[PDB]
């Protein structure tokens, strides 16, 4: 009889990398990086609020296109790209720092409080910012201008008499020409200071003409200042104030907010990218490195194939597989490893179980260390801009890069070590298979050097499946095969 | 006669991970996370310099609570969760940096200069700022204020004749009201000009009220200014002033500032974190990512066990442990790796010492490479925050967070591939070990299947032990063996 | 006949670091770390701009040592660490970032715009600044005064009707003393604001005295603005401005600045660094953390040896080179791997191809992963810094740091990794080779356990050989061997 030592193989493999191959055929592998999204962001489990026409900003202030947002509060505010400003021009210097804690705070909770602005005319309004049909202001402040010719100075306190902290939101108008002002304020010159008892910001207004947007030459500069529990709000203005109505709530927690013109869809998706909900099975993706939520880590590569079987030889370092097995068998599809035979009752094949197993636990190991294993990340750093800023925005960009490159070495060199492992740990069950059978035959057998033993006694098909089964007695038959060994 | 070749096993193993198994018993783990303090700071190696009450900017300035802090140098300044401040209302714009600075600097060494101010009043004190129970002021600045109900502009200089940098601590006094400004500086202005030849700063004073402080409505501004050597400090104001009384020696080393409420203690210990000094045998902590001097690297993980024996099989690619040996031996206790035998003579047990040492000396290599090794690192970035500051302080924790979770990344790999490494040499040497016997018994013996020759002569105790020294003659028992081998 | 399977070995071997070993000695490695630069910048391939005495700013401005630098274009400009200023003193708030935008820009490309200047005098000239022999100013600023002791208040505008961004550069002349100023500007005040649809800018001088240089003890501070297409520019200022003369383009690309002092040379080099062009073969480098173009990545190790041979074993998990096998060939010089023979036709040493092949290539592999595959970096993070500054500039040093600790974990783990793999391998395909042997001779002879068959019958040359190439028939010996073998 002859019994071969073998493993299965397919027609088609596919390529992975290794540590000393660029391209090696496998009979299976899987795609390490999420390449696509289903171009929609889920609206489960995250919970989104679509900015549409409004910028997270605009609807801080009360833009009269915003009113719908009042109080509103989210897991990710979704920024549209057609968002617009459409009420008094204003800035906020260090614009992106606020738009970050109220990001990051995930509420627009506001509470009206009242404070005591003796002798002044309260609720300007312009026809820069028209809520319905008329002239109007940002909502959650409040413009004051001169009562009667006079602008009295303004002398408020707001005590934080809660458990929390308060944001409070306020402004300074500065006038297109002295002529307002004189008009506005009944005053040349305009002085705001706002403080606690750990902060003081103090402003002066810087008259000129800007460009009219809207129609109007003046502009607002936004500032905030927050008021811890046991602290209190000082406001000291002799002109110029556009005055808090109240403050927000600052909470802490996971929200955040993209820019992104993806569609909100009805599904379930843990991560969100700007391009839209991706899968987070695979450990990278490749996709975009703004992300939100249970993600891939963001890497350079395309593709990255992790070989889930072993190496494909149609029709390693322990030399069995591609090796002194000549190739594998595409006949056999019920086991990675077996046993092809031929005694004096015809030809047959069989898998083996425990060795197919054996390699089997081993790749689903390694799959288990790498599927569905993704980090939870939240409200992080912007990673693209519109604006040349200089020091700061280098230092953004060059900590991101730094880190793709970090992620990307990771994944590369972890899929090359996997797979050189993979390839060796298939070779070595096919190895041990052979020199358990050999073991088993004893003196019976000899090896023919390509993974076939020629047995030098009959051999019928109980016999056979004795050496696979490893109930074969050597010792039944070694009276015959030792005379037909050993003959001259 | 039998002799078997075997390994060492223990009832109890540890459990480690590696690339194919989250969960794998091995005779011998070491811990490489350092997860506990002892709750002190050590006082060696590190000069501590302990702040008590005081913060380092308060200890700068000389506030009456820090006067015991004079010209203190330090390797590590201990900030106090109770410290406070005790003198006149101030703040320092970008207050940060300047305790970084001085930090990083190690040194309050301070050298009075005098400066002409000539025509105004010097040493102005408050009763917010008590030294004993007299009113004072911060002892390295000068409160300038008019003499005889005039304030002459003041325009001094100071070269730097030095051969190093000279910091320069000043300020600008803050009016709650018109009336003090008129009171203290006898003019309705004030202005500040500090400039070098490589610098300017300028300021004015902000009249307001702020909420009070030990009944201050007032505030002081902190500012500095480096003058480098041939450089001249000059300064030109006409009110507001709070003057330096002299500079500070601006240092470079390796020097920094810790929060902590850690006790210091009498003991040594190179690493430092605000828990307390930890040992740095291990290569990784999660006691804490601030720390000083030569520390593990933080990572999240709360331990990682690093293998240092075999796989544990009591009562790999090699195949041999938890192979075709069936399991280990519990009752060999001198070797991990020998022969068990029997002969005419009986029965026994023996160590073989060269691949125990083979396997022990590749074990103490990895240690060897892991373990004592860890880097110094003394001034670094903030990484814990009071108040939310937006963009910079976003940048800030997103690098400690990267930095992080490429350590957590590199520690899990790291001991994933040598637990997978550890099993499989010892797996081999175990297989060496089988082989080299082997091929000492020549035709004499036959290989039973399971890690046992069955020895085909009279093999006694002599013979075992040529057999296990490497001395055994096949030629001397060939002829006896083959007889007993090949008959019907 | 003895046929005995063996490996070649050289006198003097290399020591390379493994994951279980520091040191141990192998036929061959090769340097991972480029750790020489040939001290020139090299000009090909990327366009360097010598700086001379001139730095980027200064040229920008147009300070007259620096007019031949006009509409100039680099990939790299070059700083050359003897630059000077030597025109009206002046400063930049936030120089870093101007020379880092337009460092990155890489143009200096000019063009005049004409601005309606009504009513003052223009083209302001110092003896501060010298072009030819005459007093004269920045080229591309113009420094405006009143015209017959009146300075009518300016408000022009300039429309960005082109297709591309504009940058201006503009600027605040800061008197020495009230003086001038009315002496200058016929004013005691001064105000400027610069403004578009987008942005507002609004500065007021700070009278005083600042040190003298070249005699002036006035300073002018340095402004910018960015003017989108469909933007304008206005420009309101009532005295103190230094304006500009038209705008520069500002472009996006991979141009950089670097600080050097190294002499540009004829020769062609992908990577630049502050200290020459080093060459990019290697995938690490130890000369300089600041790199332009396609560069090794900055590592802190001075060497790290990768292996290119097997064990040197003169005069691993397989157990064969440095194991079973007693020492290496030094006498094969033609192979890795071989046959040394004795027959009755006398003593031989022949390579074996096959084998040799197989090491080679996959060493190869590893070396086609490793070399010559850089990644390009241009603009970045400034690295090196001369003057303390706390914050920002701990974050950049910090990032750096992380960044290059983290790049010199991943090199010595390779290198150890790959090191260990490369001993592995070649042990490996000793052993197969070993086995392959045996398997052909079948019963015909035996393994001496030294890597030495004894064969026994005659084996001629041709014999040998026919084991040599793999066509030896055992059968046609057999019965010799047999009879040889198994004799009393
Ligand atoms: C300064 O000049 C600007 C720009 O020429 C003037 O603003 C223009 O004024 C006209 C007439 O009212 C408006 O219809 C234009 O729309 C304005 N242009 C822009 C782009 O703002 C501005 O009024 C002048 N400033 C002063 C105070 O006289
Ligand atoms: C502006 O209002 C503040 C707050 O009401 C006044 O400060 C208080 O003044 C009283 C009377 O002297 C003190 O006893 C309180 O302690 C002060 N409160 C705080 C929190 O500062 C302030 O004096 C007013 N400012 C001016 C210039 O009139
Ligand atoms: C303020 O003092 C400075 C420094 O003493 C004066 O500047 C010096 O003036 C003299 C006389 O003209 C010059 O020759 C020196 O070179 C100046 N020194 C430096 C370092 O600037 C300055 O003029 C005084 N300011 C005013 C407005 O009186
Ligand atoms: C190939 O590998 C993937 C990933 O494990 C698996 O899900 C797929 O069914 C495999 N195909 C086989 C084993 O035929
Ligand atoms: C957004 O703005 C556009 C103007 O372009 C307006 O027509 C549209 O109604 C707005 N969307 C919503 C839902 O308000
Ligand atoms: C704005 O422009 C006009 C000049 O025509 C002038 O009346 C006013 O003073 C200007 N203001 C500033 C900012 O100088
Ligand atoms: C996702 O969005 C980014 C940024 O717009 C884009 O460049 C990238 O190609 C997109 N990726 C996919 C898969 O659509
Ligand atoms: C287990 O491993 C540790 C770490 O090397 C060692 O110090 C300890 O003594 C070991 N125990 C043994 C070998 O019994
Ligand atoms: C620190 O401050 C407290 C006031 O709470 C004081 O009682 C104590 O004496 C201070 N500690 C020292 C050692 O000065
Ligand atoms: C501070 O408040 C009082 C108003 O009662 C006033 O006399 C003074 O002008 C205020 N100053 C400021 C900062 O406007
Ligand atoms: C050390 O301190 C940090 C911060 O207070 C804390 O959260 C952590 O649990 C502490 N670790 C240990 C081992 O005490
Ligand atoms: C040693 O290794 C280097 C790097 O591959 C190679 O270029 C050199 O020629 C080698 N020397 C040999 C194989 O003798
Ligand atoms: C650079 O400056 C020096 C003054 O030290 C001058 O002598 C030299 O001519 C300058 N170099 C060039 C090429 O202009
Ligand atoms: C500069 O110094 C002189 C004092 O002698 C004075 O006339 C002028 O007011 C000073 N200016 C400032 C900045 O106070
Ligand atoms: C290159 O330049 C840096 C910075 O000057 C220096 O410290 C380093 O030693 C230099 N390296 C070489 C190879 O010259």
């Given at each position: 009889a002859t019994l071969c030592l073998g493993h299965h193989a397919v027609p088609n493999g596919t390529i992975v990398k290794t540590i000393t191959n660029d391209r090696i055929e496998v009979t299976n592998a899987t795609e390490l990086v999420q390449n696509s999204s289903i171009g929609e962001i889920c609206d489960i489990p995250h919970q989104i609020l679509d900015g549409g026409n409004c910028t997270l900003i605009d609807a801080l202030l009360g833009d009269p296109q915003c009113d719908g947002f009042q109080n509103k509060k989210w897991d990710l505010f979704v920024e549209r790209?057609?968002?617009?400003?459409?009420?008094?021009?204003?800035?906020?210097?260090?614009?992106?720092?606020?738009?970050?804690?109220?990001?990051?705070?995930?509420?627009?909770?506001?509470?009206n409080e009242s404070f005591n602005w003796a002798g002044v005319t309260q609720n300007g309004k312009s026809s820069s910012c028209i809520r319905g049909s008329s002239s109007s202001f940002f909502s959650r402040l409040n413009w004051l201008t001169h009562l009667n010719y006079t602008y009295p100075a303004l002398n408020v306190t707001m005590p934080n008499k809660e458990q929390f902290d308060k944001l409070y939101i306020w402004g300074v108008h500065h006038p297109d020409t002295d002529k307002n002002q004189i008009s506005l304020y009944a005053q040349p010159s305009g002085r705001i200071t706002v403080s606690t008892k750990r902060s003081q910001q103090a402003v002066i207004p810087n008259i000129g003409s800007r460009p009219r947007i809207r129609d109007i030459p003046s502009r607002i500069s936004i500032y905030w200042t927050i008021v811890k529990p046991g602290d209190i709000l000082l406001?000291?203005?002799?002109?110029?104030?556009?005055?808090?109505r109240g403050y927000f709530k600052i909470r802490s927690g996971k929200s955040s907010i993209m820019r992104?013109?993806?569609?909100?869809?009805?599904?379930?998706?843990?991560?969100?990218?700007?391009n839209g909900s991706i899968p987070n099975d695979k450990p990278f993706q490749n996709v975009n490195r703004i992300?939100?939520?249970?993600?891939?880590?963001?890497?350079?590569?395309?593709?990255?194939?992790?070989?889930?079987?072993?190496?494909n030889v149609p029709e390693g370092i322990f030399g069995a597989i591609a090796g002194f097995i000549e190739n594998?068998?595409?006949?056999?599809?019920?086991?990675?490893?077996?046993?092809?035979?031929?005694?004096?009752?015809?030809?047959?094949?069989?898998?083996?179980?425990?060795?197919?197993?054996?390699?089997?636990?081993?790749?689903?190991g390694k799959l288990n260390r790498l599927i569905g294993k993704t980090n939870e990340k939240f409200?992080?750093?912007?990673?693209?801009?519109?604006?040349?800023?200089?020091?700061?925005?280098?230092?953004?960009?060059?900590?991101?890069?730094?880190?793709?490159?970090?992620?990307?070495?990771?994944?590369?060199?972890?899929?090359?070590?996997?797979?050189?492992?993979?390839?060796?740990?298939?070779?070595?069950?096919?190895?041990?298979?052979?020199?358990?059978?050999?073991?088993?035959?004893?003196?019976?057998?000899?090896?023919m050097g390509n993974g076939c033993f020629k047995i030098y006694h009959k051999c019928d098909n109980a016999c056979i499946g004795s050496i696979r089964n490893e109930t074969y007695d050597h010792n039944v038959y070694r009276d015959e095969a030792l005379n037909n060994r050993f003959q001259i």
């Amino acid at each position: 009889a002859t019994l071969c030592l073998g493993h299965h193989a397919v027609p088609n493999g596919t390529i992975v990398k290794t540590i000393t191959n660029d391209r090696i055929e496998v009979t299976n592998a899987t795609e390490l990086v999420q390449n696509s999204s289903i171009g929609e962001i889920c609206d489960i489990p995250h919970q989104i609020l679509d900015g549409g026409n409004c910028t997270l900003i605009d609807a801080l202030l009360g833009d009269p296109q915003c009113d719908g947002f009042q109080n509103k509060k989210w897991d990710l505010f979704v920024e549209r790209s057609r968002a617009y400003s459409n009420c008094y021009p204003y800035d906020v210097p260090d614009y992106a720092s606020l738009r970050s804690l109220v990001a990051s705070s995930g509420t627009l909770e506001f509470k009206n409080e009242s404070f005591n602005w003796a002798g002044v005319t309260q609720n300007g309004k312009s026809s820069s910012c028209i809520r319905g049909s008329s002239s109007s202001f940002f909502s959650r402040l409040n413009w004051l201008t001169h009562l009667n010719y006079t602008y009295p100075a303004l002398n408020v306190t707001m005590p934080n008499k809660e458990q929390f902290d308060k944001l409070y939101i306020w402004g300074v108008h500065h006038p297109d020409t002295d002529k307002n002002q004189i008009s506005l304020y009944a005053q040349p010159s305009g002085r705001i200071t706002v403080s606690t008892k750990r902060s003081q910001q103090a402003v002066i207004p810087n008259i000129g003409s800007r460009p009219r947007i809207r129609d109007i030459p003046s502009r607002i500069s936004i500032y905030w200042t927050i008021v811890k529990p046991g602290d209190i709000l000082l406001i000291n203005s002799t002109g110029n104030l556009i005055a808090p109505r109240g403050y927000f709530k600052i909470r802490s927690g996971k929200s955040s907010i993209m820019r992104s013109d993806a569609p909100i869809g009805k599904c379930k998706s843990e991560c969100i990218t700007p391009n839209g909900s991706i899968p987070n099975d695979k450990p990278f993706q490749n996709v975009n490195r703004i992300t939100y939520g249970a993600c891939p880590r963001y890497v350079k590569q395309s593709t990255l194939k992790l070989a889930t079987g072993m190496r494909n030889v149609p029709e390693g370092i322990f030399g069995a597989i591609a090796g002194f097995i000549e190739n594998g068998w595409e006949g056999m599809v019920d086991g990675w490893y077996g046993f092809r035979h031929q005694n004096s009752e015809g030809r047959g094949q069989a898998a083996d179980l425990k060795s197919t197993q054996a390699a089997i636990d081993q790749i689903n190991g390694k799959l288990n260390r790498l599927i569905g294993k993704t980090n939870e990340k939240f409200h992080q750093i912007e990673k693209e801009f519109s604006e040349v800023e200089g020091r700061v925005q280098d230092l953004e960009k060059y900590v991101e890069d730094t880190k793709i490159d970090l992620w990307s070495y990771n994944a590369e060199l972890l899929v090359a070590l996997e797979n050189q492992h993979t390839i060796d740990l298939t070779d070595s069950e096919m190895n041990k298979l052979f020199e358990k059978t050999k073991k088993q035959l004893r003196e019976n057998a000899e090896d023919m050097g390509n993974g076939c033993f020629k047995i030098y006694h009959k051999c019928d098909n109980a016999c056979i499946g004795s050496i696979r089964n490893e109930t074969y007695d050597h010792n039944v038959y070694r009276d015959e095969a030792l005379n037909n060994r050993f003959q001259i």
